[PDB]
Amino acid sequence: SDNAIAMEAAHSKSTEECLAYFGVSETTGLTPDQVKRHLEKYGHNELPAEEGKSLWELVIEQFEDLLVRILLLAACISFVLAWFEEGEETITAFVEPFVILLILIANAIVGVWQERNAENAIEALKEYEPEMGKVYRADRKSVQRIKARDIVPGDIVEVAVGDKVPADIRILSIKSTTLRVDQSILTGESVSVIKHTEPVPDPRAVNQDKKNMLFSGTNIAAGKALGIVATTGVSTEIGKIRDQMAATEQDKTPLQQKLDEFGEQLSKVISLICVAVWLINIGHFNDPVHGGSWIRGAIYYFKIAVALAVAAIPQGLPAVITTCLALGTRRMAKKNAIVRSLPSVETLGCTSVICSDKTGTLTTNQMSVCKMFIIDKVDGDFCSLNEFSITGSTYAPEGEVLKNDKPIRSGQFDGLVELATICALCNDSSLDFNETKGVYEKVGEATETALTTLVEKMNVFNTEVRNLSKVERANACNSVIRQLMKKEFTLEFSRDRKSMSVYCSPAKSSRAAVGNKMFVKGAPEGVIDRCNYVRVGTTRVPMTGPVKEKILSVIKEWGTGRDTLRCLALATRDTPPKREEMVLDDSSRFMEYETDLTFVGVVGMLDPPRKEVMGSIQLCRDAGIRVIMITGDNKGTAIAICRRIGIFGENEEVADRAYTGREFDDLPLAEQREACRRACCFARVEPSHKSKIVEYLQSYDEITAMTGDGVNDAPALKKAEIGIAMGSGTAVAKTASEMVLADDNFSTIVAAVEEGRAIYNNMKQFIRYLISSNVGEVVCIFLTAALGLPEALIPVQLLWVNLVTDGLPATALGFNPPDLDIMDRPPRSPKEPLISGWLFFRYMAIGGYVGAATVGAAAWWFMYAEDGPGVTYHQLTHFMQCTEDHPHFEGLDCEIFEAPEPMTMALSVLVTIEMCNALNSLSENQSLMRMPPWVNIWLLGSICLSMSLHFLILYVDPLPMIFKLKALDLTQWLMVLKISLPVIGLDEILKFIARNYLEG
Ligand SMILES: C/C=C(/C)C(=O)O[C@H]1C(C)=C2[C@H]([C@@H]1OC(=O)CCCCCCC)[C@@](C)(OC(C)=O)C[C@H](OC(=O)CCC)[C@@]1(O)[C@H]2OC(=O)[C@@]1(C)O
Ligand SMILES: CCCCCCCCCCO[C@@H]1O[C@H](CO)[C@@H](O[C@H]2O[C@H](CO)[C@@H](O)[C@H](O)[C@H]2O)[C@H](O)[C@H]1O
């Protein structure tokens, strides 16, 4: 982007001037060529980088280098203070600080990388949830949603309530009665501000004075408007205020709490073992009080404590957790489950209740009129209707009307003529043929578009359509009907009457003798009471009780039937008041205007459930996860749908498991709480009922997933453990949620729960693996110090094992395939400890065997080895007396006790045991005989890499001279194998005990 300013003083220009400056028609929008040129000139609508990645690594490197240099200077001060009179052994005090320096450098490197890895994992979340916007462009007549970064200056953009403003926008037209905007992120204003479209004359006016502009980042609090993009990217008012840092996420995840508890307890245990080593050596309490005995006897305990600290901490664990979470997040996003916060992953597996909206999530929101009836014959008490069916489930105008499964012509019935007239006039929506996809798409609400499609199918006025193109066919019959009745105005919907109407005057064309007419479309509950008459074809009879009961009976049948239809009543005021009589500024009077109606007919439209919903409901059943439907349908239809998708049984009694908002409010408080623990169906629900349901569900210590999309959903989404916003819904709901459904599908919720379970299981696996490895290392150190043996392992090798040798297999355990019963077990408790009970004893045995095996191989080299000396046990424990008391240990050089061969034996045994235990860590209970090792190929590859690196630091000459190791032969490797492989048998015995005797 070269020109970084775009249009200046857009608030000062008028709408005409702003459209003229970019040369765009407001009707069509930008042409593809205009979009290409503007994108090339002004660049994408986005801000560069994160916060400052080009100068961030240097900061952390220099900060940790300062933290290293200060410890170096402190240790130097200590060693220099140990020079005044302490001059006994200055040779041994020369090796310890070198190792400590290496430890500090290594821990600094990993502490930098793990932090950067976590930051990159957090930042990768944003790539999965790209901000979207709605534009009108010349290639399509309907509004199309695109990525906000693809919006360019001059674009015509549409914003509605709950949307996030994608660019700095000059308001062109306010479609709603008022436009209120929340500008708290910019001006810091509290209450929403009112916008207009008049120009603001002051060129240097403040943002609060720019009452005709929409600033990027702000949110539409109320209304709907159209505008033209003035500036994008950095030129945006919010792009100038790039200096803004919100508070961190905080709120420690339960896993982090358990890990920190482990850290504190491990500090205590390190202190306990450091004291226990002194407890073993009681003879040190018989030494003289003066001299240099206590000093040199305390230096040894200030070193073994450091070695034990290296052996005890799983240094590489946080990187493995971060990588597992990042890759699982990418997997979930590949499966349409867009996680907005890493903690939510852990929570996803604990989900005990899923509260889902019906329309759009459990169903496809692809509405279609499939049944309709009008009045046939009325004889006092007898009432007969003309029922019909309609084929075609999409919005395409393809299908026909069927009477008793036989096609008829809709124009024969005057009732159906009026039916179609009402459906065409009480309709703000239309159809647009997408020639690229080659399909018909909706322009407006699914309901009104289904009405439009029905009018196209019916063709009550008999119009030629076989010679029309796909574009001319979409809105042909509706245009025909519009040519006759001229819509004077529209009485908008209102809750108090549950209907809408249009005042229409007939055009002066052989139909002016009809007079003005009001056409009413609404819910039967609201419309039928206001009908005094009933249209019979072209005549009219008075509306009575029996007719009303017949209408209601058929509506009930369709609502509770196999199709679970939502019916719409259609009526018309034949003798409406005059335009001068009616006032339109207050909807409270509209119900009065829509009185003395004539009932014409009823349309039954279906919103089919998604074909995967039943199976996902079953999966939640097997997983012990309750599913509660929340719908706008009536209670009867709601229960019928619950039986259709499997929430309820086809024959079970549900008088206490299905409620309406009013019924739920009529119950006392204790009964409300008690009803939430059993209800699975809520119909006709107020926005506060979601929050109340979440609170009641929390009162039973349940982890609730609650779906939403609108602004009134935001509080509940905030209270719920897993707020789930729809991908097509508002931005306000998305910002208040833990997960977004890219496809708005309930099955995606189920898949997210399953994936969270699997990911937490694999995390448990590699956590227990690494920590049992650390247990084994600590046991090795303590067993060596207790028996007074030489150091079988040095802390450098321990760092290499914890960071490199074991880091690869743990990351690979992150990719373990999920168990076949992952969704046939109850939800995990969030307070579930990772290692306790039988697992404590199991991994304690494992770690004890690890330490015993390492130290025992180190001891085997000194004794029963051809390459090793003929040293016995009584002198190997007294090896420090070799240089002095030589006749007691006469034989070879004393330096043979500082040999690299026993350390190499111990390290090889540790590495082999850790590969074997990684193989054992593929499952918690299943033995290797049942689940083969070749199921997780990444584990095999990681073990190959670990062994290749081991052979590298053993044989490739420059490296074993650094690791203080010596290459081995076939006999020593065979000993390593013989003393390492039985760990598989040990864990196999423990698994057999857990399976065949510890299931309860
Ligand atoms: C790494 C080296 C070991 C020795 C260690 O200190 O870990 C202990 C300790 C801190 C716990 C223990 C370890 O305790 C022992 O192994 C007893 C040692 C006695 C030997 C002396 C006999 C001569 C864990 C390791 O035991 C083994 C047997 O599995 C399990 C678990 O750890 C976890 O669940 C990991 C959580 C991140 C913790 O009980 C944990 O403390 C609690 O806070 C938890 C919940 O952490
Ligand atoms: C003065 C001494 C300092 C200089 C060191 C000389 C270079 C050493 C060669 C090894 O390089 C290391 O290899 C590790 C693994 O191959 C990496 O660990 C990374 O990968 C592990 C597992 O893949 C994770 O557990 C670790 O956290 C993560 O640091 C680590 O980054 C990297 O440097």
Ligand SMILES: CCCCCCCCCCO[C@@H]1O[C@H](CO)[C@@H](O[C@H]2O[C@H](CO)[C@@H](O)[C@H](O)[C@H]2O)[C@H](O)[C@H]1O
């Ligand atoms: C695209 C446009 C075409 C679609 C229009 C659909 C046509 C239906 C319009 C009906 O108009 C009303 O019809 C009533 C009869 O059905 C008339 O009542 C007349 O007849 C009744 C009995 O038939 C009497 O009870 C009433 O008093 C007397 O007003 C009434 O005046 C008239 O306004």
Ligand code: NA
């Ligand atoms: Na929430």
